[PDB]
Amino acid sequence: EEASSTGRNFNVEKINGEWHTIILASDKREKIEDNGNFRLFLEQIHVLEKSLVLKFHTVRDEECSELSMVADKTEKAGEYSVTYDGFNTFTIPKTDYDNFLMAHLINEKDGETFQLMGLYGREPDLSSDIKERFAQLCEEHGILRENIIDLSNANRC
Ligand SMILES: CCCCCCCO
């Protein structure tokens, strides 16, 4: 079964646990390129009553660095916010809980904004069919494939 965090049947407890960054996409490509602040490799999501604790690592000069963030529920069901290189809000438009999680995020910094979309998998990679469904979701948000970066060959430390 599949759900969206904004849907009535969403079960947030089911996204708890191990996740890996498979693909990142953005309408401001520099944010997810090699030294971008948003080129983040997810490791796990810990579901709490009104928040999510996100564990990531960043990479630089082939060196990993851990980082944890707390995302708080906002007034809209299925939406969370977190302060990181500006103000961010995100939702999960589509997940099947057992294989993939597709997230959509809006960042606001210095009076500007950009969209980030991420495809996360329970394993370190996903099938080509799920990757295509993700490309279709990015297209629905005005993000060209040339702005979609598959990181499945670089998500391990
Ligand atoms: C629990 C999913 C983390 C949201 C990250 C934003 C998509 O790149």
Domain boundaries, the chain: 1-157
Shortest-distance Cα residue to atom 8 of ligand 1: 118
SS (H, E, C) 32-95: HCCCCCCCCEEEEEEEECCEEEEEEEEEECCEEEEEEEEEEECCCCCCEEEECCCEEEEEEEEE
The resolution in Å comes to 1.6
Pocket-forming residues, ligand 1, beta carbon under 6 Å: 45, 52, 54, 90, 103, 105, 116, 118
The CATH number assigned to the domain with range 1-157 reads 2.40.128.20
Pocket test for ligand 1, best of 10, 42, 122 (most atoms within 8 A of CB): 42
For 60-86, letters b (16+ CB in 10 Å) and e give eeeeeeeeeeebebeeeebbbbbebee
Ligand 1 centroid vs 61 CA: distance in angstroms? 24
Closest atom of ligand 1 to 120 CA is 2
DSSP classification of residue 105: E
Ligand 1 centroid vs 15 CA: distance in angstroms? 12
The rounded distance, in Å, linking the Cα atoms of 57 and 39 is 9
Query: Sheet harboring 63-73: ordered strands across?
Result: 17-18, 41-48, 51-60, 63-73, 80-83, 87-95, 100-109, 112-121, 20-26, 148-150
Ligand 1 centroid vs 86 CA: distance in angstroms? 15
The rounded distance, in Å, linking the Cα atoms of 87 and 153 is 29
